[PDB]
Amino acid sequence: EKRKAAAAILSLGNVLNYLDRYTVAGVLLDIQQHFGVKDRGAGLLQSVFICSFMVAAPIFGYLGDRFNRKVILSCGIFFWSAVTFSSSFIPQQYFWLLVLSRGLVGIGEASYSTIAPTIIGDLFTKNTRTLMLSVFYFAIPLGSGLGYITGSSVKQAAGDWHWALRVSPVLGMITGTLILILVPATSWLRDMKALIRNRSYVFSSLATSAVSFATGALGMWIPLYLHRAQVVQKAKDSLIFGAITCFTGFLGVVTGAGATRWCRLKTQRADPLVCAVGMLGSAIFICLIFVAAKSSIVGAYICIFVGETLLFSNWAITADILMYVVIPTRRATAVALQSFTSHLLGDAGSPYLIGFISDLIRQSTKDSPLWEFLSLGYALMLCPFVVVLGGMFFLATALFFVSDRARAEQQVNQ
């Protein structure tokens, strides 16, 4: 039973993990007005955070594979909670301290997205492990929704972003204490050389990279796209999208778990096929989103709802594939390398590239509001291509999943 309590506490930890990510991005307009900084600094905040995460991911992965995956995780929790609360103090004249604090949160936050999945895989190993991983990666929609919900609520309560950056750290420190208490006590060069020869894991990592590309581009451009659609058609969109994303992620993880359970009764390849059967499907509805931008009066872009439901589904099935195809001593490094390759090719390169494409299309022709909306749509047409490539790489994972699962099980046996 204490494994269920440990899984619940790690789920809450992940909730605070993601709520501490989008808190500095749901109130970014107020921070931009406060420090006198411009769009360059607004991008720089999350850019330095992501680069810090990608620097500190392999190191914490290797450390977790080495020694005491629990104290590292609790120390990371305590670190970024204490760092965010301290960053709340930061005056107006000092912006590079805020940038440095986001960098330190990035360092200290690679010890939860790359270490907690290993503990979850070590607690349960069955369909209940799939259920607990569904909870842990449903904490991702919940974090990404409550981030904007809290960012709006705090400015509805007081005229500060300081409360947005102060409300979470106390609960994060409480979660650190409970992680340290209620979680039971469960070469690198050669390991990494042996993680690229794993074809199932390689193609699953590519699929996750494509998923992250899609999520990043859509999340940082769709609100402005719908705003331009309203402008040509003739604030609250933040909370609307946050609530939509939260409920849709609930629905998506439920759909993914149900489809995996109903499809595992037919073939051994029900983990890497079903995601593709969703992902391609998601891509299809993504295209309809743009059509929904033309005449949102009848159907108010519910294709966002459907595509997000079919896309926020594979987060836990990717973790299941990883736990199947990677032996328990290499799991922390496998997750760390997967996250490094994901965020290198994903949500750190999606919004900037989409903006560059939009700039090229807008500069190609004389500017007009209808042309702005059309240029953004033509630039976001690239997202379905990446989702389709993610589906194709999930099928490529399906080709070798059974072989790699058998090999991993054999090596685990001895």
Euclidean distance between CA atoms 169 and 404, whole angstroms: 41
Euclidean distance between CA atoms 337 and 331, whole angstroms: 10
How was this entry determined? cryo-EM
Does residue 296 sit in the same domain as residue 226? yes
Does residue 89 sit in the same domain as residue 209? no
Does residue 241 sit in the same domain as residue 354? yes
Distances (CA, A) of 104 to 79, 110, 288: 8, 10, 40
325 touches 401 (CB < 8 A): yes
Does residue 260 sit in the same domain as residue 187? no
Does residue 131 sit in the same domain as residue 217? no
Residue 23: CA count within 13 A, CB half-sphere: 28
Q: Which domain holds residue 320?
A: 192-413
Euclidean distance between CA atoms 390 and 267, whole angstroms: 21
Euclidean distance between CA atoms 98 and 373, whole angstroms: 34
Q: Where are the alpha helices (DSSP H) in 295-330?
A: 302-311, 315-325
Resolution (A): 3.5
Euclidean distance between CA atoms 161 and 155, whole angstroms: 7
Distances (CA, A) of 225 to 23, 108, 182, 219, 283: 22, 34, 45, 11, 17
Does residue 375 sit in the same domain as residue 301? yes
Q: Where are the alpha helices (DSSP H) in 88-161?
A: 96-108, 110-113, 116-123, 127-157
Distances (CA, A) of 20 to 30, 237, 305, 330, 388: 17, 21, 24, 28, 31
Could you tell me the CATH number of the domain that includes residue 231? 1.20.1250.20
Does residue 202 sit in the same domain as residue 177? no
And the tokens for 326? 């990677």
What's the domain count of the chain?
2
62 touches 188 (CB < 8 A): yes
Nearest-5° Cα angle at 364, 362 to 367 = 45
Q: What is the tally of helices (H) and strands (E) in the chain?
A: 20, 0
And the tokens for 281? 């499907």
DSSP string, 210-238: HHHHHHHHHHHHHHHHHHHHHHHH--HHH
Does residue 219 sit in the same domain as residue 333? yes
Q: Which of 128, 163, 191 is the last residue of a domain?
A: 191
Does residue 261 sit in the same domain as residue 295? yes
For the chain, what percentages of helix, strand and coil (3-state, to nearest 5) are there? 85, 0, 15
